[PDB]
Design a protein around this ligand. Structure first.
Ligand SMILES: *[C@@H]1O[C@H](CO)[C@@H](O)[C@H](O)[C@H]1NC(C)=O
Length: 181
């Protein structure tokens, strides 16, 4: 019942160098991890067949895009860890539909921006980790300051990698005037 690419513990499944997201994952596996995966993107509805996941981890992957509604069909997911990845693009609705998500980690992916309203609709979120990314502070990030001010979640300090004028400045400290636009 455990997928061939993955090795499965009782409640946990680890998939390494998987060429596709398995749709056969046994129920009563609440945690799934993808390490050094073969697949280059996460399309919409990839996890539809694994509704029981409370925890998801992506690490050491190279992704062209993580699509809108990629995580649709995961009503029970509390923890989502996307870390130490190469991600070229992240869609505004990528995380749409996770109401139960408590902890979200984008940390250490070297992401240059984030789209507006990417955190829209995640109510249960107590923690977001944006550290370890190279953020270009510009018009596309201007929303992020407003979100950091009004957010209920705990977010540790993050800094602008660019442009040269703003480098190594706390994004939380910035004001909307400084963003140009
Ligand atoms: C943070 O949460 C409290 C209670 O959960 C709420 O009253 C407050 O308005 C929230 N902050 C916002 C929405 O900026």
């Amino acid at each position: 019942k455990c997928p061939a690419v993955c090795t499965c513990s009782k409640d946990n499944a680890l998939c390494e160098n998987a060429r596709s997201i398995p749709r056969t994952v046994p129920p009563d596996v609440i945690s799934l991890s993808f390490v050094r995966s073969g697949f280059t993107e996460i399309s919409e509805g990839s996890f539809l067949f694994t509704p029981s996941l409370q925890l998801l981890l992506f690490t050491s992957n190279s992704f062209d895009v993580i699509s809108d509604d990629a995580f649709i069909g995961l009503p029970h997911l509390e923890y989502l860890f996307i870390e130490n990845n190469n991600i070229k693009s992240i869609s505004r609705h990528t995380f749409r539909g996770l109401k139960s998500l408590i902890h979200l980690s984008l940390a250490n992916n070297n992401l240059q921006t984030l789209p507006k309203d990417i955190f829209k609709g995640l109510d249960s979120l107590t923690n977001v980790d944006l550290r370890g990314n190279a953020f270009n502070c510009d018009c596309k990030l201007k929303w992020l300051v407003e979100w950091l001010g009004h957010t209920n979640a705990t977010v540790e300090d993050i800094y602008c990698e660019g442009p040269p004028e703003y480098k190594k400045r706390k994004i939380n400290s910035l004001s909307p005037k400084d963003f140009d636009c």
